[PDB]
Amino acid sequence: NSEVEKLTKNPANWATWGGNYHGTRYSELKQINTSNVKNLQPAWTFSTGVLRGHEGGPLVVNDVMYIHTPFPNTVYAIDQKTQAVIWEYTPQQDADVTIPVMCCDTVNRGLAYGDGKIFLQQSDTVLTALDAKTGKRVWSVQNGDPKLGMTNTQAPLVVKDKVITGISGGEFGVRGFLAAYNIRTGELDWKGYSMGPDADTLINPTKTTTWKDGKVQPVGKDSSTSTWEGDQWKIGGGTTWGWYSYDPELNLVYYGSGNPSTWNPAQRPGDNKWSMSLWARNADTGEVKWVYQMTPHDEWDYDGINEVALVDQEIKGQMRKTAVHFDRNGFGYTLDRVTGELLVAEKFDKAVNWASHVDMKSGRPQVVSQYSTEYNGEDVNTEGVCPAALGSKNQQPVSYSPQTGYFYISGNHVCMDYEPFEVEYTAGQPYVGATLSMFPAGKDVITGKEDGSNNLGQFTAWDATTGKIIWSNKEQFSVWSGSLATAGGVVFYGTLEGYLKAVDAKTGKELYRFKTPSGIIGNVNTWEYEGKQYVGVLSGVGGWSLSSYTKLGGTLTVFALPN
Ligand SMILES: O=C(O)c1cc(C(=O)O)c2c(n1)C(=O)C(=O)c1cc(C(=O)O)[nH]c1-2
Ligand SMILES: [La+3]
Ligand code: NA
Structure with a gap:
């Protein structure tokens, strides 16, 4: 959408989930920088009036602040002059049908803006367009069916004259798709399934390519169903609950697909x-x-849905248009985002042990049989797999600084025992089939050696041109918030104890911290209002001893330098 594109070129806005379409979560604002961020203070706060996990972050367009909540997904438009609500919208949703099929808390990743409207993807899968100035509903469409186990937790994305939204339900046998709705009417324009025949997936056998035998090659016929036994793909997962990015010059939308339904791999060869x-x-x-x-x-529920950040960077002496992705499986991937050529694939937490490496010719991870849950078999406990199913990184999106050339990863440092067992599908019921327990990785993030630690999180700086850790800071709990990098040389992120932290973008040294009321699982975003830069974050623990550090919450804290 060229209007949204124009809005994102104004650093005073934060007009998409990721600040820009490329998803780099980098702001050119530099009023707050490494010299003065120690002087940051909370400026004002706002309770959302809702409990449970507060993912996503504020969306600021032409001085109006828009914020969203977990179920029932109330939306507020806030006036920064009066710090009062301009309008609010609370959908009517059936809690008894929607809550039981939410796998991982009642979270909502946020809003989109476009064509004078705010777009809210509701938990019950109704996608709703609201007038951005009045908050009145313009259109809505039921994007899924919660009676089949479908929910929505992810943020929509405005792209050209469409609103892009996905689906959740990889633990409920839902077949994943990405759908595009007309921005003006809500009519469905196209729907791309993650598996099935070409008319469903919108794969072109001679034009859609993949990495194979060391080169980009056409995917061929029956690329999906020939890798499934019989009709198992009809309930086969690959859901789409992560973040979407967009390259306007290529007119390409980028995203990841989730786990192949049941957690028992021997059941779905x-x-x-x-x-x-x-x-x-x-x-x-x-x-x-x-x-x-x-x-x-x-074999582990390492959902591939994490964001795909688009950056131009030098690899082997040539400027490349790349896509960078830090997967649940603990590998950080760099691809050519035009051709899909695989360039880099290395572990961003050296505790990772389920695969030795990613084979660069075949593109496939080489599974280490001791940590293969299929190899050990049904009803046999696979012990000490790293990472845990919740991954080396979960939903929390990364940031990128062009000043350093580093990505900043809000990382998990968690391993697991995992025991699969055979399960049967019933629509509306869970379709899992594994018993897990988790514990601290207990190994150095950089060397991979046992270290006597018990930290559950890491905050890690990564060079995606070589696939190397530059520095990493231990965090006592997993880091579940989306960071922010800025032209002031600082990186912001939130902790599950509720701290908003700022660190030096180059070195990782801490420069600021403040205890907000609840663990932060949202995104730190920044904007400019009447010439002053503000930094905003939602607090409210959820998603996925911590309970002695944080209780449930739901507030916005806005920080700024004092006057
Ligand atoms: O397979 C799925 O469809 C689906 C959805 C979600 C979701 O919608 O939040 C999660 C997961 N899977 C998942 O595997 C996971 O670890 C997870 C963590 C969280 C969270 O917000 O903290 N959501 C989800
Ligand atoms: La999943
Ligand atoms: Na095909």
């Missing part, structure tokens, strides 16, 4: 394509430009 994959789709038609499967035949 085959690569299970295209679960656990990265995708580039034509924004106008949905046609897949390229797809890359990171985790064939998943």
Whole structure:
């Protein structure tokens, strides 16, 4: 959408979930910098009036602040002059049908803006367009069916004249899709499934490519169903509950697909394509430009849905248009975002042990049999797999600084025992089939050696041109918030104890901290109002001893330098 694109070029706004379409969560604002961020203070606060996890972050457009909540997903438009609500919208949702099928708290990743409207993807899968000035509903469409186990937790994305939204339900046998709705009417324009025949997936057998035998090659016929046994793909997962990015020059939307449904791999032989994959789709038609499967035949629920950040960077002496993705499976991937060529794939937490490496010719991770839950078998405990199913990074999106050339990862440092067992599908019921327990990785993030630690989180700086950790800071709990990098040389993020922290973008040294009321699982965003830069974050623990550090919450804290 060229209007949204124009809005994102004004640093005073934060007009999409990721600040810009490329998803780098980097702000050119530099009023707050390494010299003065120690002088930051809370400026004002706002309770959302709702409890449970507060993911996502504020969306600021032309001085109006828009904030969202977990179920029932009330939306507020806030006037920064009076710090009062301009309008609010609370959808009517059936709690008894929607809550039981939410796998991982009642969270909502946030809003989109476009064509004078705010777009809210509701938990019950109703996608609703609101007038941005009045908050009155313009249109809405039921994007899924919670009676089949479908929910929505992710943020929509405005792209050209469409609103892009996905689906959740990889633990309920939902077949994942990405859908595009007309921005003005809500009519469905295209729908791209993650698996099934080409008319469903919008894969072109001679034009859609993948990485194979060391080169970009057409995907061929029956690329998906030939990797599934029989009809298992009809309930086969690959859901789409992560973040979406967009390259306007290429007109490509990028995203990841989740786990292949049941957590018992022996029950579903085959690569299970295209679960656990990265995708580039034509924004106008949905046609897949390229797809890359990171985790064939998943055995651990390492959902491939984490964001795909788009950056131009030098690799082997040449400027490349890349896509960078820090997967649940603990590998940080760099691809050519035009062709889908695989460039870099290295572990961003050296505790990771389920695979030795990613084979660069075949593109497939080489599974280490001791940590294979299928190898050890049904009803046998696989012990000490790293990472835990919740991954080395979960939903919390990364930031990128062009000043340093580093990505900043809000990381998990958690391993697990995992025991699969055979399960049967019933629509509306869970379709899992594994028993897990988790514990601290207990190994150094950089060397991989046992270290006597018990930290559950890492905050890690990563060079995606070589695939190397630059520095990493231990955090006592997993880091579940989306960071922010700025032209002031600082990186912001939130902790589960509720601290908003600022660190030096180059070195990782801490420069500021403040205890907000509840653990932060949202995104730290920044904007400018009447010439002053503000930094905003939601607090409210949820998603996924911590309970002695934080209780449930739901507040916004806005920080600024004092006057
Ligand atoms: O397979 C799915 O469809 C689906 C959805 C979600 C979701 O919608 O929040 C999560 C997961 N899977 C998942 O595996 C996971 O670890 C997870 C963590 C969280 C969270 O917000 O903290 N959501 C989800
Ligand atoms: La999942
Ligand atoms: Na195909």
